[PDB]
């Protein structure tokens with residue numbers, strides 16, 4: 001009823017052809033057509049994408065199925081799992097991510113599902129945020145276990161800074177290939193986030209002092225003492241960032257590895 005009155009009219013096979021099933025998710029099934037097409041909470045997802053238009057957010061085009069811009073570079077997931085990123089490369093991705101979060105938070109929107117799987121890359125090195133299926137001071141236990149802030153896990157009145165935590169977990173993936181406790185169960189991971197809070201790196205000695213600082217400001221247990229997207233954009237670590245072209249050899253490596 002509300003849904004039909006938002007979505008455009010017509011057969012979703014009248015405007016688009018060459019349907020090649022690229023991915024599969026719990027949310028739906030992602031196809032390519034160049035555009036990308038997927039097939040109460042579904043209403044919230046569409047409206048959020050329409051009103052919050054930033055170059056650091058995957059551009060929403062139309063609905064009937066959802067139609068978006070196609071980012072040929074793939075997901076940050078293949079880069080974090082198949083390649084080794086240098087600190088400059090990690091800083092470049094973090095800066096673009098905080099630029100997406102800054103824009104969302106300022107416009108009073110919490111993402112709640114920040115992870116590498118929701119980071120799409122352009123063939124030019126562009127870093128863009130997607131999946132607003134979970135977006136919303138707040139009190140519902142929503143997200144992906146391994147990326148959830150402890151206050152979300154423990155069922156406390158959480159805010160926009162929960163996205164800063166998951167970004168800190170996403171920095172761990174960039175370093176190690178996986179979020180902390182990925183070997184464990186999603187349920188075991190939940191107990192571990194609540195009981196341990198700040199996760200440890202397997203090899204912190206390998207990181208620089210600024211990168212160790214940026215990580216501790218993303219993963220601070222005290223919400224007030226944890227950084228905001230505005231605060232972290234001016235961080236020392238973000239100054240060592242590389243141009244976004246430094247990410248295109250990473251994209252080339254992930255394509256070759258996942259073939």
Ligand SMILES: O=C(c1ccc(Cl)cc1)c1c[nH]c2ncc(-c3cnn(C4CCNCC4)c3)cc12
Nearest residue numbers: 022023030036038066068069070071074130131
């Ligand atoms: O998924 C959505 C999306 C759809 C609907 C909604 Cl409401 C939100 C988001 C994409 C939107 N624009 C995209 N641009 C590129 C890709 C992409 C490139 N490569 N790949 C991979 C190929 C191998 N299998 C794993 C995925 C996926 C995916 C999307």
